[PDB]
Design a binder for this molecule. Structure first.
Ligand SMILES: C[C@H](CCC(=O)O)[C@H]1CC[C@H]2[C@@H]3[C@H](O)C[C@@H]4C[C@H](O)CC[C@]4(C)[C@H]3C[C@H](O)[C@]12C
Ligand SMILES: C[C@H](CCC(=O)O)[C@H]1CC[C@H]2[C@@H]3[C@H](O)C[C@@H]4C[C@H](O)CC[C@]4(C)[C@H]3C[C@H](O)[C@]12C
Lengths: 202, 202
């Protein structure tokens, strides 16, 4: 199929882009470095492949989509779970994701685009909020026969993942603070789930 | 006093550095631009004034020190306050600080040093943790005759300020998400203090 070939060729470009980004550095790599190694899989690529920034955000699209589905499964294997249970399930899969070197490496790239006058980053975030994993958490909140949990469901989902994630990711990205190993992950999820569900008065 | 003159001259350098950073841009400004406008208040300045990065972190030192004392006062004007009260007091002063354009502007500068091979940023954080406002919160936690609150006091202080601050500051800095006005600040502090003290089961 010609369409399979198109998608194969795009996959080649992105893989090249990522190899460069990881190897040469995002800042050091230009679009032309990418085109040169893409060879004859890149003539002109019209499907948003018009820049280094766009290639990066194409790659980020994929990664976001896979994190989402991985985290969905973890929660899906829940049998009438308590709120505690599904929060803990989600917590563990979410926190594990942000404790891979991958997440910090992409983190650095994003932080470095703080002064980019192009704002591909703003467009990317604006244009795929639906693809973010907090939406999974939002969905359960609404299914709680609790009026506080349903009216605030988005805000609660964001709160919880923030408690799990920060300021650690931030410090990982900015100064290369060490990642959490698995024990520490579990520890922090339990710590956070308790406060979130129960408050510190207890 | 010769010592007063020294400190005056340093204050001139930093003010010049900041004016440049704000006006020309941190990335566009070099040390020599700073020295040129510093004129005869900068011959050679030996007290860590050896680079653009160091000047920035000198300025950040001051700002951090003032945020700390402002937030201390707010909590100091508390008469045997409940945990709710002093958390709310602290919340309001902390959240207000991060909703000034200043905080976002400095935020951007820091994010842009993500690839700096010099790591002045890591040294700065490592070398003045004591000066961070979360220490104020840590202090009250230990004065609670609660064993959970004292053993975890640092972790709880960091948690709370994180709930107040993120992911908003992050989005302010990365994509220029709008700041919170005062109503929204108060709203968010109350929202957060409730969950923190009481959990979502209620
Ligand atoms: C997964 C992805 C990039 C890969 C990573 O660095 O690991 C991260 C980086 C920046 C993140 C976004 C923002 O920086 C932070 C926001 C936090 C809230 O949970 C909403 C999602 C939120 C809008 C994030 C969604 C997503 O997880 C992002 C896009
Ligand atoms: C106030 C100061 C810079 C000014 C700002 O951008 O407004 C901010 C920027 C980065 C912040 C630091 C980190 O990025 C985040 C950390 C969060 C925890 O509360 C510990 C303090 C913590 C280590 C922060 C302390 C402080 O408030 C910093 C240094």
């Amino acid at each position: 199929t010609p369409s399979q070939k198109v998608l194969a060729r795009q996959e080649k470009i992105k893989a090249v882009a990522l190899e460069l980004f990881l190897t040469k550095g995002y800042q050091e790599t230009s679009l032309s470095d990418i085109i040169k190694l893409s060879g004859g899989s890149y003539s002109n690529i019209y499907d948003g492949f018009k820049s280094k920034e766009g290639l990066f955000f194409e790659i980020l699209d994929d990664i976001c989509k896979k994190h989402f589905h991985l985290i969905y499964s973890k929660t899906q294997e829940i049998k009438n779970g308590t709120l505690k249970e599904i929060l803990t399930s989600f917590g563990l899969a979410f926190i594990e994701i942000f404790n891979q070197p991958e997440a910090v490496a992409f983190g650095k790239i994003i932080y470095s685009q703080v002064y980019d006058k192009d704002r591909h980053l703003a467009n990317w975030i604006e244009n795929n909020q639906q693809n973010f994993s907090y939406n999974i958490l939002m969905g359960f909140f609404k299914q709680q026969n609790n009026s506080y949990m349903k009216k605030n469901a988005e805000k609660l989902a964001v709160l919880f993942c923030t408690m799990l994630k920060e300021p650690y990711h931030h410090l990982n990205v900015l100064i290369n603070a060490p990642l959490k190993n698995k024990k520490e992950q579990k520890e922090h999820v339990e710590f956070v789930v308790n406060v979130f569900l129960n408050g510190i008065n207890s």
